Design a protein around this ligand. Structure first.
Ligand SMILES: COc1nc(-c2cccc3c2O[C@H](CNC(=O)C2CCOCC2)CO3)ccc1Nc1cccc(CN(C)C)c1
Ligand SMILES: Nc1nc2c(ncn2[C@@H]2O[C@H](COP(=O)(O)OP(=O)(O)NP(=O)(O)O)[C@@H](O)[C@H]2O)c(=O)[nH]1
Ligand SMILES: [Mg+2]
Length: 172
């Protein structure tokens, strides 16, 4: 029966420049990317142990704005869980979260899709989104909220591991 470790397909979504790539590269390479090189689509893989279970994370790092609609629908269909990322110094990115979540719910035709709300750049001083407002949004969705910094690494492992735990709860 066991043919190899369990694989989880994770998709990182959110507005341009919120730190999707930086979060992922911090997880994979333990490296902070200071440059802003806009992504088209990149795939990463990492084996980790979460709650005593070995797993392979297949992580799709997406473009903030994806014009080809058909490619976007494809990764939403294939993804098992979604990190919905905003930047705590960018109110507009926070307002956009609702739109990412709606699109995902429509493609998966479900109210109950594994997701984590991620407030990134929590190292920066010019916060415009209060922690309490983000926590309230996440509570309204029934999903976890995690504050992260791709720079300091605060919350980075937690965000990805929490998402895996959400997928597991959903599969059971
Ligand atoms: C392609 O398989 C993967 N898939 C995902 C993945 C995770 C979550 C959702 C996904 C994903 O890819 C899917 C594969 N893509 C598609 O089917 C595309 C093909 C072109 O038209 C549009 C659809 C789409 O949705 C993430 C990582 C990998 N793969 C990967 C990552 C890093 C390293 C390697 C190994 N390589 C460097 C030797 C493989
Ligand atoms: N101080 C700080 N800067 C960050 C953080 N995360 C990302 N950045 C910076 O924000 C800029 C954008 O990051 P990047 O990961 O490219 O964002 P993205 O969401 O992948 N953009 P795209 O959607 O175009 O692919 C980069 O200059 C990066 O260094 C963080 O937690 N703290
Ligand atoms: Mg990127």
């Amino acid at each position: 029966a066991f043919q190899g470790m369990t694989e989880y397909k994770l998709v990182v979504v959110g507005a341009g420049g919120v730190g999707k790539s930086a979060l992922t590269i911090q997880l994979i390479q333990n490296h902070f990317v200071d440059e802003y090189d806009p992504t088209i689509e990149d795939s990463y893989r990492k084996q980790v142990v979460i709650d005593g279970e070995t797993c392979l994370l297949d992580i799709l790092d997406t473009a903030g704005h994806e014009e080809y609609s058909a490619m976007r629908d494809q990764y939403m269909r294939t993804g098992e869980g979604f990190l919905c990322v905003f930047a705590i110094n960018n109110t507009k990115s926070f307002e956009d979260i609702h739109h990412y979540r709606e699109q995902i719910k429509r493609v998966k035709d479900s109210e109950d899709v594994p997701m984590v709300l991620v407030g990134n750049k929590c190292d920066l001083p010019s916060r415009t989104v209060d922690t309490k407002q983000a926590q309230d949004l996440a509570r309204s969705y029934g999903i976890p909220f995690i504050e992260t910094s791709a720079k300091t690494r605060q919350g980075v492992d937690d965000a990805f591991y929490t998402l895996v735990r959400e997928i597991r709860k959903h599969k059971e």
